Design an enzyme around this catalytic site. Structure first.
Site, PDB file in Angstrom:
ATOM      1  N   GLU B 137     -13.938 -40.906 -16.576  1.00 36.32           N
ATOM      2  CA  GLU B 137     -12.636 -40.627 -15.956  1.00 36.32           C
ATOM      3  C   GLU B 137     -12.464 -39.166 -15.516  1.00 36.32           C
ATOM      4  O   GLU B 137     -11.965 -38.887 -14.421  1.00 36.32           O
ATOM      5  CB  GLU B 137     -11.539 -40.920 -16.963  1.00 36.32           C
ATOM      6  CG  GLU B 137     -11.179 -42.373 -17.108  1.00 36.32           C
ATOM      7  CD  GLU B 137     -10.008 -42.728 -16.231  1.00 36.32           C
ATOM      8  OE1 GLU B 137      -8.842 -42.497 -16.662  1.00 36.32           O
ATOM      9  OE2 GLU B 137     -10.273 -43.226 -15.112  1.00 36.32           O
ATOM     10  N   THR B 190       0.073 -40.681  -7.635  1.00 37.48           N
ATOM     11  CA  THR B 190      -0.069 -40.079  -8.982  1.00 37.48           C
ATOM     12  C   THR B 190       0.123 -38.564  -8.871  1.00 37.48           C
ATOM     13  O   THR B 190       0.778 -37.943  -9.726  1.00 37.48           O
ATOM     14  CB  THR B 190      -1.427 -40.415  -9.649  1.00 37.48           C
ATOM     15  OG1 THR B 190      -1.553 -41.836  -9.761  1.00 37.48           O
ATOM     16  CG2 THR B 190      -1.528 -39.806 -11.062  1.00 37.48           C
TER      17      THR B 190
END
Lengths: 315, 315
Positions: B137, B190
């Site tokens: 990630e 985001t």
């Protein structure tokens, strides 16, 4: 087909010192200890009004005037709420030092309210005495701390989830959890301990802290020790206040080297507490903290106990 | 005197959507739901390298290059750590929309890591896969969220007590606790949901929040409902982000009027979740939230489940 009545026209109550903040839980966690505490004696009087007869252990520092004193304000409000005309004399005995970071004002106030309620035949549930103890504190010192007052009155370990509305939650704690309190013979003002806090903090610092508060609550509810150790980090308040407390860094290090789970300022200081998991460990932690303050020529008192589940006590 | 072996040279894993933040626990609480989620298929290859064969449900939005894609980076790191030279082809199926606030990137990554570990004979404990999913990630999206990744991989409800070092705690939750997720067919970045957060917050606001985080953790550990309701107040993040989500205020009000315990943004949005205590309640909450978005002509998908205790699943 039951009669009970008390012929007593006086009562004496003891209310315990409390440790507020408990590391990361600034303004929201608190727990009661066995010692020290304050004592309040109330007698019924045919002469009207709530009056203060006498204060001891005080150095004449506390307000003798009934409308200025936390205990008399509390008791007066209680009587007014229930619409009772009853004269009351109060003798107050401080068995603990003021502004010590041990919930001194709270203990007195809780002692008075508990006392009046039992003496007049338990007209209210102990639960419901909290607001009176809060209003008392507020009107006298301009400032009320539920994380001192609630555990003092209720006993045990408490989370203050909200102030408005007042939302208090008692939590279970492991039975082998000990608190060592050291109180140095020096006075740091509550005033300077408030002013020195930051007004603004970084979001990432706040997140770090509320992670820890969750880690601590979970750690207590689940009787896990290792999690409590790691959760007792305070990155906001202690670094700001610790400059006010002489020897703080050495004392904290000495407690951690003696095997404390964690160690921080009690309430607004200068008292310091450590948590451990046995009464051998708690005692040697106390000895190492004492040795820290002695090395800078500051007198100190050490107290060791489990969390006091009783709260106030008729004596 | 036991032999087990798998003749399979491929595996398919499904990994669930997660709800992060959970109201007051910004960056520190998260839990997995049943649906939706992502699927990863891995096959063994005689040709070297970790390669992406195919991505579906994507709108070609995801990186096809193996050194740029979260799943391939994760799997490559896993193989490197264990010193394995093995070719792997990845087929990735998005069964959920990207940037939905449902832990989309996490699900893919957890699916890949879980997959590779089981396919090569379970050389590592599931516990120990977390860092690989985190590094994956981090290297791909420059940013890793343990409150998505941990519950995704481990199942259940999780407290992320610290990021460095990574300290994760799984918590019990009441078995009759339901989550209704609504995902509106609109995309809030985001990027804009991060930038809009305050950099600094008032101390008293932080205190209000960490009280609540404690109230929520205690409420779950103790199977108390009424405390959870009161603890699900977010005074910092939701008021900042909710301007980005169309209809948020109406949708929240509709969930609360339909009897939700509480309701907030899921992760960084635009998805919204509500908690309730039965599958009748969860369904009518879902219906009222749907009706909120329909009234502003925004398409919506609703999912209803208890907390998913399984986490990833071979399919």
């Amino acid at each position: 087909n039951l009669y009970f009545q008390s012929m007593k026209d006086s009562i004496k109550v003891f209310a315990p010192a409390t440790v507020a903040n408990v590391s990361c839980g600034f303004d929201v966690l608190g727990f009661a200890v066995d010692n020290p505490g304050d004592e309040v004696l109330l007698r019924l009087s045919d002469k009207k009004g709530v009056r203060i007869t006498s204060i001891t252990g005080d150095d004449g520092r506390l307000p003798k005037d009934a409308e200025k004193n936390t205990v008399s304000i509390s008791i007066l409000r209680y009587l007014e709420t229930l619409g009772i005309e009853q004269g009351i004399e109060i003798e107050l005995t401080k068995k603990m030092p003021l502004g010590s970071g041990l919930g001194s004002s709270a203990a007195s106030t809780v002692a008075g309210v508990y006392a009046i309620n039992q003496l007049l035949g338990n007209k209210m549930e102990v639960k419901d005495l909290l607001p009176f103890a809060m209003e008392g504190e507020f009107l006298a010192c301009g400032s009320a701390h539920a994380d001192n007052v609630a555990p003092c009155l209720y006993g045990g370990f408490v989370l203050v989830r909200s102030y408005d509305p007042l939302d208090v939650v008692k939590l279970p704690v492991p039975a082998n959890l000990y608190a060592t309190i050291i109180h140095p013979h020096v006075e740091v003002q509550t005033k300077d301990a408030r002013n020195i806090l930051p007004k603004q903090i970084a979001l990432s610092q706040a997140v770090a802290q509320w992670g820890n508060v969750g880690g601590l609550v979970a750690g207590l509810l689940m009787n896990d020790t290792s999690l409590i150790g790691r959760s007792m980090q305070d990155h906001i308040v202690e670094p700001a206040r610790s400059v006010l407390i002489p020897g703080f860094d050495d004392v904290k290090k000495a407690a951690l080297d003696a095997g404390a789970l964690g160690c921080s300022i009690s309430g607004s200081g200068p008292s310091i507490f450590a948590l451990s998991t046995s009464q051998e460990a708690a005692q040697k932690i106390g000895q190492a903290m004492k040795k820290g303050f002695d090395a800078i020529n500051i007198g100190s008192d050490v107290y060791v106990s489990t969390v006091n589940q009783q709260g106030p006590k008729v004596i």
